[PDB]
Amino acid sequence: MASRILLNNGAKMPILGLGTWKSPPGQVTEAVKVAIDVGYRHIDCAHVYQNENEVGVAIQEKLREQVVKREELFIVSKLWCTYHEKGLVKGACQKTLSDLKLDYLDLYLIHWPTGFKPGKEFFPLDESGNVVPSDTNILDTWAAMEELVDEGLVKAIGISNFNHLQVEMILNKPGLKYKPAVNQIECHPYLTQEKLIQYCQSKGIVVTAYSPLGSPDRPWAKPEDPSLLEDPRIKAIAAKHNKTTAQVLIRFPMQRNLVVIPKSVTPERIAENFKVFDFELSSQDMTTLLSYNRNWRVCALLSCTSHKDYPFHEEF
Ligand SMILES: NC(=O)c1ccc[n+]([C@@H]2O[C@H](COP(=O)([O-])OP(=O)(O)OC[C@H]3O[C@@H](n4cnc5c(N)ncnc54)[C@H](OP(=O)(O)O)[C@@H]3O)[C@@H](O)[C@H]2O)c1
Ligand SMILES: O=C(O)COc1cc(F)ccc1C(=O)NCc1cccc([N+](=O)[O-])c1
Question: Is 49 known to be catalytic?
Answer without folding.
Answer: yes
